[PDB]
Amino acid sequence: MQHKLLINGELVSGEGEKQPVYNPATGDVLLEIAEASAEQVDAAVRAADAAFAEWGQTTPKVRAECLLKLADVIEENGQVFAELESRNCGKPLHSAFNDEIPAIVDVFRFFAGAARCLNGLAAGEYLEGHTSMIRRDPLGVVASIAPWNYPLMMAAWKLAPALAAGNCVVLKPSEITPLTALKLAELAKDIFPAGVVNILFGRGKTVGDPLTGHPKVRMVSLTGSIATGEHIISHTASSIKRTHMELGGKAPVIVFDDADIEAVVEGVRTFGYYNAGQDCTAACRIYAQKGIYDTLVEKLGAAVATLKSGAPDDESTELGPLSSLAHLERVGKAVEEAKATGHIKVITGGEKRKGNGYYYAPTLLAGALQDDAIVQKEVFGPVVSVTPFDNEEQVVNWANDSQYGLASSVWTKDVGRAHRVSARLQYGCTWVNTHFMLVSEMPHGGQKLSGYGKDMSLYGLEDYTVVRHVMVKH
Amino acid sequence: MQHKLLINGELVSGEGEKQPVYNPATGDVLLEIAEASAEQVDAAVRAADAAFAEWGQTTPKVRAECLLKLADVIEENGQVFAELESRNCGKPLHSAFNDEIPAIVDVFRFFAGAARCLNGLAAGEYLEGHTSMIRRDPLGVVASIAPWNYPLMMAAWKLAPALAAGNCVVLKPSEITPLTALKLAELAKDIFPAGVVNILFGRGKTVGDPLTGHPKVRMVSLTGSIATGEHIISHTASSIKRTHMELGGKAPVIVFDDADIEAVVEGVRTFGYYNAGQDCTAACRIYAQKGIYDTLVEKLGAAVATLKSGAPDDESTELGPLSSLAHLERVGKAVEEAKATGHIKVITGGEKRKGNGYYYAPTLLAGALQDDAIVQKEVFGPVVSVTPFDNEEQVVNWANDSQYGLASSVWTKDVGRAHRVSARLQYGCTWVNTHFMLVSEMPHGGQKLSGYGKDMSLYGLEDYTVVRHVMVKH
Amino acid sequence: MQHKLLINGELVSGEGEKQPVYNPATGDVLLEIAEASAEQVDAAVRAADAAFAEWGQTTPKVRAECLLKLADVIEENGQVFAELESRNCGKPLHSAFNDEIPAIVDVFRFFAGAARCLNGLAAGEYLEGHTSMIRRDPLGVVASIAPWNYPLMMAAWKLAPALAAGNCVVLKPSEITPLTALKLAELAKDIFPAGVVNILFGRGKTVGDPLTGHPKVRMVSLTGSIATGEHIISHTASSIKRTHMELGGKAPVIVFDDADIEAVVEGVRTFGYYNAGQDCTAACRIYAQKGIYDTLVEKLGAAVATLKSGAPDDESTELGPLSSLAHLERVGKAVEEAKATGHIKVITGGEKRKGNGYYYAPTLLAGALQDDAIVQKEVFGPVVSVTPFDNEEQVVNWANDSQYGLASSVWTKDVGRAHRVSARLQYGCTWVNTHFMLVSEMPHGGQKLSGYGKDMSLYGLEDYTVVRHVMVKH
Amino acid sequence: MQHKLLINGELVSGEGEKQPVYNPATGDVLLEIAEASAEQVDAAVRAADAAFAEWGQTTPKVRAECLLKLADVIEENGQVFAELESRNCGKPLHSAFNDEIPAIVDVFRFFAGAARCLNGLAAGEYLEGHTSMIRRDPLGVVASIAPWNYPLMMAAWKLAPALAAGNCVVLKPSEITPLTALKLAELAKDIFPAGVVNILFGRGKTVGDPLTGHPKVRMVSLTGSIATGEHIISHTASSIKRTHMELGGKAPVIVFDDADIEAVVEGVRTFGYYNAGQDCTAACRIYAQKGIYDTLVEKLGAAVATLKSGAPDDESTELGPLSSLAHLERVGKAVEEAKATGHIKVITGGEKRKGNGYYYAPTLLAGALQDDAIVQKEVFGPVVSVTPFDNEEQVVNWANDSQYGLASSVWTKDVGRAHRVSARLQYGCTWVNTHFMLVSEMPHGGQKLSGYGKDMSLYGLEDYTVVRHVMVKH
Ligand SMILES: NC(=O)C1=CN([C@@H]2O[C@H](COP(=O)(O)OP(=O)(O)OC[C@H]3O[C@@H](n4cnc5c(N)ncnc54)[C@H](O)[C@@H]3O)[C@@H](O)[C@H]2O)C=CC1
Ligand SMILES: NC(=O)C1=CN([C@@H]2O[C@H](COP(=O)(O)OP(=O)(O)OC[C@H]3O[C@@H](n4cnc5c(N)ncnc54)[C@H](O)[C@@H]3O)[C@@H](O)[C@H]2O)C=CC1
């Protein structure tokens, strides 16, 4: 149980107000943790700023080596990290341990390698008698704001490319889920020079506002809700801060008549509900051609109904709780508002579970229409909707008439159709005949209200550099 | 006398309010032009949105061809274009014809070539049994907002990459300098399909606010002031619009003891006052090493005093007027504030010219200190200040202690020093033993409050695309 | 009608031996052209080496501009180039004019653009206190050897990236087909500085050998047979000359049971027999799944039998003659070899056309086995074989057990299978559900005995550069 | 000492003839090692080729992990590798351990990361209704030939990119210096799947020729002499094998009047004679402007003469022996022909050292002229020549009139000139005011008779891939 902030190479108790941290599987408080005070946010940013003079002139190879050691330390401590995440998030331990930990280590190893591989334009005399070259320099201090659904994983996605690029970082995890960030703080303390990495604790208003609005923070990076994104953008507009934003999605799952229906069902059973659907790429919005609609709904309803909820440290557990009491009510409301339309049918689920801890039933809803709030707004819970469609053109225009733009999939056995739909979809990512898969080499990020900017890949690193032109007269 | 807007392939009169356009050399009204109405702003964006369906799916080759045509049409009308810009802007005719026109033509020809040269990640199996590929797709409707200092040039810088990336465009020129834009509108009418290029006219509040606020606008690109920049980021925050920003600069000209002093004087006499200093890269704030400080002030004062003001259409004319009455007043005020410091000597200039038109005397200001407003804040007039400095480390630190980050130069004969200073400058571009030189291949753009995003280069193209990951299960 | 060599900016008669050039549709001599003498070969190389001192220091902009004006000139002379190519090669006029001319113009336009877009590595301090940058400089004099199948087109493929990169070029066309290249010589005389382009006439032994063996030639680029590839490689090994090689292919066309059979027939009818099959990507070797083999053989033999041979200048003509008397004998003996195998049935064709000029009948052969010479060796004629297969793995292993690696296609409606096979095929190109399509943006070039290096695309330009590291100590 | 071959996952004794390995400090025989037999060569290529089936389809993540593992194993055994290298090559122990070992480990760590960062072209529709993507797939079996100057390091330069690209490898070390190769074999046995790495022992003619001439080998990579290069090119010509060649250089050291003479002296003293000058980037050829010529020659002579020879395992030792008796015989004869020219003065050295072991005296030769053999031919021993020049243009022309193209440097304080001369030099790399410095991210490789292709950097990985165009019809 580690509870202190990391500021300028030191572990320090927050001197701000204490706040409760819950075990969502039971509703019990794990502990109370004191927030960073106004003075602590400011000290953190100042240390980062002072660390940048030397840190921002390091070589790729030195940064690469810091990142590989950070990778090793997380890997050697995988068990402890999974346990804290499962306790804090209610993730089934086996899921946290087997799926997330290996990914988090790999993010770090991949960004170590990428640090050393940055592209440019050929240097030469584009104007007679002058030599031009292009560099990628870092920006300075980055404010990173991580969400509650993948606490350590988001932390890794924000830290790794910022560091790789030669910036100093001030990280605020969600106040719901600080436990693994504060264990990382303890373990990562001496890997980077003092002030290069600072990790704080507390709420958006009390810690987040002073952080993101500091005159020395040159870039804010955020993964959370659109209203938060909107807020950070206006709040930092007076200093034209670089922003980097991932604000959720509402992935259409387009299933045509020639899809392997069993594979769709097997897929959605996992991708609709994994992490209780609190996932920015959740397979939550099915468009199913009218030919296969009834068969899909029946078979999906029956596969979803067998998802096993239980203790997170039980291996048989597939579906854990929601993140907080408030989130549970949020998800519950959305479903009741679906029900209230009169044409949406509950195929299975649609209830909070009995007990303490924040469990909602795995839910499937059918007969959802394009203009329904269930289709158009992100629910972020263990809830999947099904909408009938007639034809390719109509369903592509529906999928793309969305304010979201992060992820999507198409299920069809036809080569031509898969490539047509793929080319047209206005989403950061499109899977063909699967969903959900990410690799550290391939960029994750949105368009429209989903945001802009990439996590993972070389693009991810590029977002934390400024491209510069130096032209030398002969 | 071309006064009509281009909306959906048609030349139409503005149905909003009449406004005056002036000749800055004489102070006379050139004509009055009806602004675009609220309804016309909305029709333009609707046209571009509907045109995007087909235009976003065109090939690189087809967009390139359209862009070569556009280039052609500008070069065929270069003499006319240069005349309109001179009349509206007060630019010397020979300068607008011999410097601006070819560069404009070349911007379009460059971007035609780069539309076909877009980079990606090697397609392949990053996860066993799944082929990943990476795409660069267009955003939709771009709202482009251009300044009054380089009206046709900035229009090109905004039009060329956005079209090359596959977007549709709604362009608003400065209400002060619309004449080349409206001539472009007539000339380029049938080169792109209806709705792909739309050009309007009117002020920021009455036309720019409803344009950048349109729900169908996905990206807003602005060259203009910091205040305008902050306001647009605030205004479009609610829809997380991509923003692309170039908000000016204050280019440090760092001159060491071993510099070629006569080449510095020759350079600054051009690059300080070209365009009356209304240039986002003007050589406007000199740091001069103490060994050469007084000789430089001496020789620069004498060279700046000879700069010739006169009729724009006269080949001997070197310095034209400022853009408007209010911008003359702004510049004048700045100069007076420097005087009132008590420690700043006027070496030459520092008065408004008698006569009609908005002429300001070419001005050198000496004894400017680091913390003076004349050093920290962009004047955007024919005014340069000179500050003495001691040593390399001190001056780099002073130069980098700015809210601006666009352009800069270092003058020194030593290779080591030139590279050391160039590596450390926090500026989008640094020149060595010159200033001011731009080529279509090399990006131009800032950091800090100068903004982010590039114009020109492969990078300025990348800015109008979304990176997409498509992954196909085997 | 044009017969002079281009040497150092002058048009001059060969002083070597006269050689005959035939019209292959009639077997008549078009004219006799004197070869470059050994002195002229030396002289053209020394002119290119002399021109390289300035040409290799030109800006991308200037090279681009040369290339666009060359593109204009070809376009302007489209009709004439098509007639000469049709006369000298037997290509149906409509095809040379409508297919080849527009691609040739486009190649030069594409490379104009790509010349300004060359990639590199971010410049920076990879070693503390040292700034490294990466350049892409030209090699020098490039000897270019073109084949008889696509005379002007291959001339464009060799010239365009070599010039774009800043090399000087000494081109040798096939002695069988020099006519468009000599017209090129006249037309292009003055677009580049003297000696930057040189065009010669003559055979391999008398002209190629002295050219490719010249001490100042730094790179040889050849499209032609494996034996000429082998020979050039030996003959230039003494001076580690850079080689660039496209040596033919034997494209596997893989047809699965779920293919659109009618589309495969339509495709192979054009792509097996376009240019009388004298094409490096011809669809010449079908592997047909057991399920559809017999249907495919029946439908294909019926489609092949309608191919209309006749006067090249007739709009209805689809199949022109072979390139020479010797090539006709070669093709003929290949077909008699299959037949003598005792298990290959002639479905249609399989003879010489009556009359003069070098026409072979459009030919389909069925029952060819994996180890038959008809399957294994390039015939380069209007001849296509068909071989049954059982399963996917078997046939991918068959297709890959070849000495060729240039092009290939897979025909299947199944997305999974399309991507599996495409991933696995050991060929420079793989089309899915089509064949033969090329674009200037995408590379074309082989592996194994097909050679190495690309034509078209940014990669094609890269092949004519040396990457250089300049490291500057602080 | 370890003497066994690594073939297909097993350590086996050579079954060919026994060859002596020498300690070049003393002339003692270290041991005898049996060569691979022709059967063993064949068996190695066959194991690699069978290993490719699965190894060529691994993900970048997997290969990178094998590479990080191998880096870990070399690092963990750093002290032993350096001892073996020292005993084998006469390298001073402190030099091999402090300089060579860290750089070798880093090569592997670098390539591990680069394996996951491969660039491509943007996937999309370059031809309407067709989706194009670009991949980078492995070649299959690579034969790598390592030299005796940096045995382990060159084995890493060849192994790391070939493996990162997805190829299998059969490495032949120099028969002179196999000890670290065969220690690596032992230690690396189980890191890769069976047959993915194979390490043989033996001579160019008995093991080399059958290895590089094998039908399953698709690429040959050689670092060695020009003769050897020319021979590998002719010998593999019949199968058009990809070759990859680093064949030496003669690096010009260009020293202008404004150079820091003391820095030039301190530089060359190290870079002229490190590794007894048996380096392809040796600072061996000085061009010294007439103003500073006599001072440089005096001071250089005095620095060179203090170079301390002595036992390799002694900390004070700076200069070790040459690599063998024959190489010492060669070096001594190159110096004798320089003396017999009648115009070269021996400033210091110019003799074999008394004793056993192959020590030659650190040697400085003055008054050598542009056309002398000592200036035009690589010597590869502790020998440096000095040539007086008059002007910049003359010396750049002198430096570029070489059949070498690997490395070079320029020493001058002037920014203009350093850039002018760097841009013009026809050398794969140019240092400015230093020489010799290599880093993993930056390519090393030549042009002209120094060969082509690159070691280290992303370029060096690209050299072991085939770019492929996959195009899917809609
Ligand atoms: N990755 C995620 O956690 C995502 C969450 N959402 C949605 O957010 C909705 C409602 O609020 P929450 O969900 O609790 O997420 P949120 O946006 O409120 O929280 C994400 C992060 O932003 C921080 N934050 C909030 N205000 C801030 C401020 N003024 N300055 C700086 N940082 C600030 C939070 O403390 C937290 O670390 C939920 O429906 C959830 O689905 C949507 C997309 C992604
Ligand atoms: N190009 C640059 O980087 C420039 C920096 N500046 C600085 O700022 C001053 C510029 O003069 P101004 O005309 O006042 O403003 P502005 O310089 O920012 O004009 C730029 C463009 O933005 C538009 N604009 C203004 N308000 C808008 C709104 N609410 N919504 C949409 N578009 C809007 C204008 O109509 C014009 O087309 C100068 O003193 C100079 O110091 C000025 C001009 C250019």
Ligand SMILES: NC(=O)C1=CN([C@@H]2O[C@H](COP(=O)(O)OP(=O)(O)OC[C@H]3O[C@@H](n4cnc5c(N)ncnc54)[C@H](O)[C@@H]3O)[C@@H](O)[C@H]2O)C=CC1
């Ligand atoms: N003077 C003569 O009697 C010659 C006879 N041959 C023989 O005749 C046939 C030639 O037919 P193609 O199919 O045109 O050969 P090819 O098909 O590979 O022709 C491709 C191009 O390579 C050129 N080339 C051929 N040998 C060369 C060499 N040694 N050095 C530089 N360039 C060279 C050709 O002139 C042509 O431009 C072959 O069967 C070959 O054995 C080849 C060259 C000369």
